[PDB]
Design goal:
The complex is a heterodimer of chains A (19) and B (140). By secondary structure, chain A is an all-alpha fold. Helix content of chain A is 74%, strand content 0%. Classes of the chains: A mainly alpha (19), B mainly alpha (140). The interface between A and B is medium-sized, with 15 and 23 residues.
């Protein structure tokens, strides 16, 4: 439920799609 | 590349796209940033919906919430994805501000985002190829 944790998680998925 | 107008143009775009109005070469970075952001918000929209419902903004806690979330976001590393999320999170807070009529809060968030870019993210951006690197990664 934690905001920064989820935001960080999906941010990394988004970044791994760009490599 | 002025970090302030990067923030200002981004926040203005994200807000006007939601129906609100806000008194706010190099134009390629701005265009690429907001395109990546719209794509980011779309994909994880359910998540951003749950996040906005837990923000619980008050005029007293606002700056605390921004500082806390952002710190934990970059606490263990910085990448371009997280930098996009940083802008998108700022956008979420600005939207939830005018949702409760706290227009002045938007200007403050804009200030805080700008201040964080210059003080922390700037050195990373320069040491990682500058904004041009981001454009090459999130463009075509």
């Amino acid at each position: 439920v934690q905001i920064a944790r989820k935001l960080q998680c999906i941010a990394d998925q988004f970044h791994r799609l760009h490599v | 590349y002025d970090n302030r107008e990067i923030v200002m143009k981004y926040i203005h775009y994200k807000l006007s796209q939601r129906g609100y109005e806000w008194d706010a070469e190099s134009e390629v970075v701005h265009l690429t940033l907001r395109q990546a952001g719209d794509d980011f918000s779309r994909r994880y929209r359910r998540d951003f919906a749950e996040m906005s419902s837990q923000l619980h903004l008050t005029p007293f806690t606002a700056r605390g919430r921004f500082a806390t979330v952002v710190e934990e976001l970059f606490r263990d590393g910085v990448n371009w994805g997280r930098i996009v999320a940083f802008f998108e999170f700022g956008g979420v807070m600005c939207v939830e501000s005018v949702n409760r009529e706290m227009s002045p809060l938007v200007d403050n968030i804009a200030l805080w985002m700008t201040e964080y870019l210059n003080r922390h993210l700037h050195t990373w951006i320069q040491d990682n190829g500058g904004w041009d690197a981001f454009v090459e990664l999130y463009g075509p």
